[model samples]
Target chain A: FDFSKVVLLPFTISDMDFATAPCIIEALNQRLMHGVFGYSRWKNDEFLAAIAHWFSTQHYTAIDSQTVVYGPSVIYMVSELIRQWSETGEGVVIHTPAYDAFYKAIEGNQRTVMPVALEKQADGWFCDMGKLEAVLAKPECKIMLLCSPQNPTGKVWTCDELEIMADLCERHGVRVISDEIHMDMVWGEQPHIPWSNVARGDWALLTSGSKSFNIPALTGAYGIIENSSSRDAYLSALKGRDGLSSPSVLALTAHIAAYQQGAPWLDALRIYLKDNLTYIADKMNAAFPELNWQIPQSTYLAWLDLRPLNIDDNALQKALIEQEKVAIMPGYTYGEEGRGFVRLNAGCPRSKLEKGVAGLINAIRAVR
Target chain B: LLPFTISDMDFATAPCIIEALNQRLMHGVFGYSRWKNDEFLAAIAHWFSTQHYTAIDSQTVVYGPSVIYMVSELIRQWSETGEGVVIHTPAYDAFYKAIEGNQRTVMPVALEKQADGWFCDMGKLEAVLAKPECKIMLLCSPQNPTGKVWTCDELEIMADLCERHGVRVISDEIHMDMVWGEQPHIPWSNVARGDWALLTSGSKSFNIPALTGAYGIIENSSSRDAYLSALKGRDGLSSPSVLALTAHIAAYQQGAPWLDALRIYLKDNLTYIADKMNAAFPELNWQIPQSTYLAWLDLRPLNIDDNALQKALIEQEKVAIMPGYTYGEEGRGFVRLNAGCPRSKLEKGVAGLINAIRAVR
Candidate 1:
């Protein structure tokens, strides 16, 4: 009687869909409305084309079509990647203040999380490139885990930087395992470059439509490696791991549809996001000076630097929850760098953003 | 009213692994499927021939939740033997989980990648296998992250090494069909007779991994039957996903043409992109993979850091790509992009990236 058991929130969600990705499912629904959900052959024409196009146009690298293996999602594939490589007595190395799931995945696999802390610069954060190069150059370190157009920080490396890093992996004989799940949501001002563009050797790249499409729930992603070395590595890693079957038939259809279609909506959404960012900046700035906020160019989430307010980020968050009835992650959770910050979701209509900012201002004052 | 049709269903649900089970959703027979199905066995046989493996029969296969999940159990069964398991380093991430979860100590031998592909440091493998304590080598054929389809000669070398040391090999042939190069994927069972070898599913070749059901194929039935029996009622094996099954049947049987066409299309795209990238940005140390649709790129030339590079791409370019360091330190100065989208999308992604790279640098 209760379908609720069948349905539960997979990830944390609040008033606004902060973590909401692009609508991959919506794209699939368009195809479904045509009533063609029968047993379609694997790697449907459009599906394969979408994949090929992704590599050719976006990654700026060549791939052997034989190497594009499909998976239900990036998260699942990452788990499998960790499981397979861990066989060699090496575990996952996740940097600190990462997506909580990365930590969970490392722990879940019973693998060690080796964090080579990123150096904080006057402008932003950066990995200790030399230290990283040194560590990965060692034969003992087998896999080098990566994030692109990263979560929270939204960092994107240049081709030259990537080449050096890739070259080091080549010299050190380490596997470059990269997660490019958020590849689509790059802001227009700064584009997203694919790691394969600068890869020195075989590189395993994971990506999906979930981030840019507002469809994390609807799963579909590809483990792409043009190099036979990395392609076979990830696929073999899938041996004891999972295959890319549809969890929900709906999701697979959506992934294909999004790649084949849904460009217009995505374009429109990006423009809308720019407007939202600007609006939020003006509104929030007017409301509260105690807290400084930076509008991330890609994601709908806003990282409010509460450090200027000199308030305990956690305590500030708690007061916000209690007084303003708002929920957000304290900056401390993302890393020490975010200690005086609060992440806010601006993925809502203008009306909602207005109300939320008003409540946030009151909440910040309460903390003060 | 529902906002969307049934197609909007969430795919990333718990029991997430079951998504791979190829079971039909409409069927009420959720408890269990016949443990031994002809189709499943035939698929394995088909794989053996395709991959040139020998000694695999229906009797050799054992069904379990997953490869990593079942490996721990396999390790437990083999623990009595003083011989331990050996896995190649930079190996599949979970191979360690299976080895350690089984409460057995693991001996690691690392793999090194070169211009052509990856080669297992035979010296290390030989040394580890020589250890009287090393019993099993979890060989990841057609490797992961760094796709390396071990050559026949290489596999034979390993088989000979294992035989000399009396070590067993658990050949993970899941990615056998996804190989892309002059070197064909040679399954371990195809190497030689009288070698302790085990193989998992070939069903994932086309698609469908989340459906939880991996069969363990051990040619030495006498040695494997008991361990297979011990696998009875292991969590989540019986309730296979018929949806995945239907899809797989269609895929493995009827999807070859489609898959073949896909391989060509994908290959073309990969090649085109590699050429384009070299022309556009000579500084990026990008390598066209010997296989797979991934292009490993290096980008330390530009002044921007990985974090800033990612930010510029996402916030300014409105394009999202995978940052390198998440993979490991070796990847700090890189970003991985998926080249599996419509040509238009790909072009747009590239354009966005060009702008982003220029902006940050």
Candidate 2:
């Protein structure tokens, strides 16, 4: 494994420890070498071609250049889409426990957040379709934020599950803003299907090299809008909203280089992350009985059920970070439904994971 | 003077910027950045204080990626449709775009061109401000195209007028750093006691336009919160480029010497262009700009309109220049020449201008 090449460990965010591909670094340096830094447009043919080619090869999906547009980040795209597609005080449906940013994006824009809590089962976390259908039936509910390879729980949505969501959303006329930021990090037999593949109505697929290539500092994402009217409306909204739509040169160049030469590194990353997950799971099973942990099918996040310990989310988080020197996102941050749970980022080296797990176990035992 | 057509400078940015960026690149992992960090805000406040000779509180500063974007955002925030935005003509083209794009009315106040430089007509300005619909004034200090640096007295009078009319001012001082020689650039904040703000960027001064980092200085708490909220509400529109932010800090902290040298070079180039205009094309009426690297040539002596002159220059001499009429109706029969280039390019551009005007004659 290329795990030995890890740089540093402070795995608090969904950030990967692996450095960017060498070609991306070279491309960035090559751009910097050109001294003159004038205004540049990112909507050029070369940028579009790189994105189109990457999607075609990686996801086996045919994405037209016209349907794709540049955005600074996935969260930005989600927020903008929600603002445009839905009215103020309207409902935006989400699967809980979800990414905390989604909650902020929805409520921050003055929209209502309708959380359809994911059902916890002996097997794994699954979406409650009846609840989703009921929520979509509300006329105020205009948008559904579908997080693929879903955050927190890291359950990769199968083709059948996505089809059900697509049919319900289509029947009720709820536009979808699918956040596939974690699409490339899936780790099981379930193949990742883009929301566009299952959707039949107005939809946008938001993803970026920021998550997969560890280049969030570049701050760029792309939206694949299947509907022409929605795409035009989104672009026009962006224009009317200050007209600074183009991404930075480094952002575009990094994406191009990542798609062009970042496959082997990504493959190695998945392998290393798989090992880290197994090692942490073993450690937790041996050392802690109050905490229930599951091997996530996707993403670097481990969803831990700490309900059996009978501790408050705030106190538990405080203990983990203060007494153990280990930091993990408290579940209550996602929603009230996320209480008594925590999300641990495992996108670090095996040694660091071992340390984090040991500390987590000791903190839990102390509480008990 | 090969093709000094662009307002962008020809000189490379300081080595410090490149070094900082290279160091950042070497760090490898580019995770989600936190732009509201202490060092970032301190660096910006420090840059403002050092550049403007005014103490700027970091709390008063709001970060945006482009000055034009901030101007647009401010216009949208301050005025509704059919409300008037007063601007001096000939004005920067983007001011018109920002006003018109936001569905606001553009009230043009023609500047009185005197012997020293362009002067604002106090009566005419007051008349425009007196109109109840006019709610904002877009002030360009060390003005673009003509490079007329507003005097402290002039700025004070304007500020008073804005206060009288209950209008907010958006002072675009992007060219504040390019005032040549010993002339001190007067920041709008020093004179404007009313609801006024400053929008500036390192792009023009540091020759890094592509980086697109801009800063807004708003002293009034209400105005500052309004601008900050507008930026935040716009989603990713206000996210500063990491490369731009890093380069700006480097340019501000360690590139002062480079800026001084560049100013000297710009002064020489302006002098050279003035000499060439007099020696080669005496018929073209002009004055040496007090600030900025633009040579505003009055082509009325040639008895040709701006479009005809622009066509001849581009077609016959293969030289491109910003046609004056594009700035405003008052800019008719004039052309703005950008002198922020190498000496060789300036010479070539001057020769081409001479040939083009001569051919038209």
lDDT of 2 by residue, B187-291 (tens): 887876756789888888888876656787876788778777655553544455667778877888888998989888888888887787777667754567889
Candidate with top lDDT is 2
Model 2 chain B weakest 10-residue run by lDDT: B230-239
lDDT of each: 0.58, 0.79
Model 1 CA deviation exceeding 4 Å by range: A1-41, A54-64, A86-92, A137-139, A236-249, A287-293, A335-337, B1-361
- Candidate 2: regions farther than 4 A off: A5-11, A199-201, A226-233, A236-241, A288-292, B1-7, B37-42, B80-82, B229-240
Please give, for every candidate in the order listed, the TM-score of chain B alone compared with the true chain B. Answer: 0.77, 0.94
User: What lDDT score goes with residue B31 in model 1?
Assistant: 22
C-alpha TM-score for every candidate = 0.50, 0.92
lDDT of 1 at B7: 12
Q: Write the per-residue lDDT of candidate 2 for residues A1-368, one digit (tens) a residue.
A: 35665482244676767677788999999988887676577787878988888777878887778888877677778887897799989999999887767766788788999989898888678988887899999999999999887887889888889999889988999999999988898888877887767767689999988888878777778888767888887776555545556457788888888888888878888888887887777788666644556688988878878787786667666778778878776777766777877777778777777777777777777776
